[PDB]
Amino acid sequence: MSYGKGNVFAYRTYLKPLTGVKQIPESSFAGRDNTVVGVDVTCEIGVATDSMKNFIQRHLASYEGTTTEGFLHYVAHRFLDTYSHMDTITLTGEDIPFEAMPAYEEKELSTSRLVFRRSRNERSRSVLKAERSGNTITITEQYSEIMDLQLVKVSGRPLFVYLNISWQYENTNDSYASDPARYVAAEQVRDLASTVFHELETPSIQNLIYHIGCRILARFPQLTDVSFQSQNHTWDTVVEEIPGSKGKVYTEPRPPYGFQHFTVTREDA
Numbered sequence: 001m002s003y004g005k006g007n008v009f010a011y012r013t014y015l016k017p018l019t020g021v022k023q024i025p026e027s028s029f030a031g032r033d034n035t036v037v038g039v040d041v042t043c044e045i046g047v048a049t050d051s052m053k054n055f056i057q058r059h060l061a062s063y064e065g066t067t068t069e070g071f072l073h074y075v076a077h078r079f080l081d082t083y084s085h086m087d088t089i090t091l092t093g094e095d096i097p098f099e100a101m102p103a104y105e106e107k108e109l110s111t112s113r114l115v116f117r118r119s120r121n122e123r124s125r126s127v128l129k130a131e132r133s134g135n136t137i138t139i140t141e142q143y144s145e146i147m148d149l150q151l152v153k154v155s156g157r158p159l160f161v162y163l164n165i166s167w168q169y170e171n172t173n174d175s176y177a178s179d180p181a182r183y184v185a186a187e188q189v190r191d192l193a194s195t196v197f198h199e200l201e202t203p204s205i206q207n208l209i210y211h212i213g214c215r216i217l218a219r220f221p222q223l224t225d226v227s228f229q230s231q232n233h234t235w236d237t238v239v240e241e242i243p244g245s246k247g248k249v250y251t252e253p254r255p256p257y258g259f260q261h262f263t264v265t266r267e268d269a
Contacts, residue, residue, distance in 0.1 A: 002088070005052045008041040010060045011096070018066040022181040024219050027191035031180075032066070036116055038096025039068055045079070046088030055079065067183065068093045069144055070176030072128040080130060080137050087132045090141075095124040095186075122149040124186035126175075142175060143168045143227075146186040146193075150233075153197060158250075161205060162231040165189055167216065170224045184220050192216055205230055205260055213264025225265040232258040 015034040023030055041056050056075060063071050072091045079089050097119040103112035129141035145166040152160040167184060169175050177183035196212045197203070203211070213226040235250035242248065 002044050002046045002090075003049065004042070004044040005049045005056070006042045008043065008053050008056050009038070009096075010041060010057050011036065011038045012060050012063075013037075016064060016066050018177055018180060018183070018185075020180040021177075021183060021185065024188055024192070026195040026219070027185075027188040029185050029187040029191065032185075033100075033113065034066060035100075035113060036098050037068075038098065038118075039071070040094035040096060041075075042092040042094075043075075043079075044090040045083075045086050065176060065178065066180070067175075067177045068095060068124065069126045069128075069142075070178070072126055073176055076128055076130040077137060080132060088129070089131075090129045091127070093126045093128075097121070097123050122190060123147055139172050142172055144175065144184070144186065146190050149190060149193065151194060151197065155202075157234055157237060159203075159205075159208075160233045160235060161208070162233060163193060163209070163212075164229040165193060165212070165216075166227040167220075167223050168225055169222055171222065174222050182222055184223060188219075189216060192219065205232060205258070206262065209260065209262055210264060213262075214269050217264060217266065217269045223266075225263050227263040228260065230260045230262075 013036050015037045017034050018032040021031050043052050043056060059075050059078060060071065063074050065071060065074065072093050076089050076091055080086060098116040099119050100111045101115040101117055103110055103115065125145045125147050127141065127143055131138050131140050143166045145164060147164045149163040151163065152158055167189065174182035192215055193212050196215050197208055200208060200211060209228040209230055213228065216226045217223055236253045237248055238251050239249035
């Protein structure tokens with residue numbers, strides 16, 4: 001038995017910037033300015049739902065951290081501490097990614113700090129589940145995720161995969177980026193996933209996601225395991241041979257797709 005609020009959109013301007021992150025060779029990620037941040041909160045607890053909406057929104061205003069993971073932790077703790085009859089809470093936070101656009105200023109092409117695209121490509125998501133037991137608050141589940149990562153590799157049939165990739169921290173405090181060097185950014189996981197795949201020669205999907213997982217675990221010893229939900233959406237060939245050219249023509253296949261669920265754990269590295 002449970003209830004709550006879904007589709008709670010919240011946009012925050014000028015959130016505290018994520019700085020001092022640990023950079024990896026496979027990603028240019030060096031932090032987040034956090035000039036504009038959007039999140040889509042789902043709240044489930046084991047009219048009152050309008051209070052939940054307002055509680056979530058005003059807590060995004062008072063939140064002084066750098067990450068969605070920390071925001072959910074904040075909101076989770078504050079819900080349990082201010083509502084006595086509530087025993088369980090599950091929070092889901094879906095990032096609305098904003099990408100800075102070009103700006104031509106002083107005869108020099110640079111990145112804007114004002115104009116941002118609202119992106120509909122891959123997006124991070126965080127889930128947090130917290131319980132009352134029994135005088136202290138315990139975290140029952142926590143993971144962060146990059147969703148809807150759609151990657152096609154041309155030979156040099158071209159493999160087109162959709163990838164959701166999740167990860168769980170050994171130390172749950174490392175997720176909130178208070179110590180920024182122990183935070184695993186979705187940007188870095190995403191770029192890792194494309195650097196692997198590029199380098200692997202004609203790999204299978206289980207082999208591809210196994211190598212991505214091991215590489216993420218190698219690059220981030222904080223993490224206990226990395227899970228994958230993959231989908232195969234490889235195209236159908238219509239013209240196999242083109243005179244002169246190196247390439248082929250393909251088309252959209254029928255709806256059926258192959259999928260795999262697998263998690264690479266610490267021992268498997």
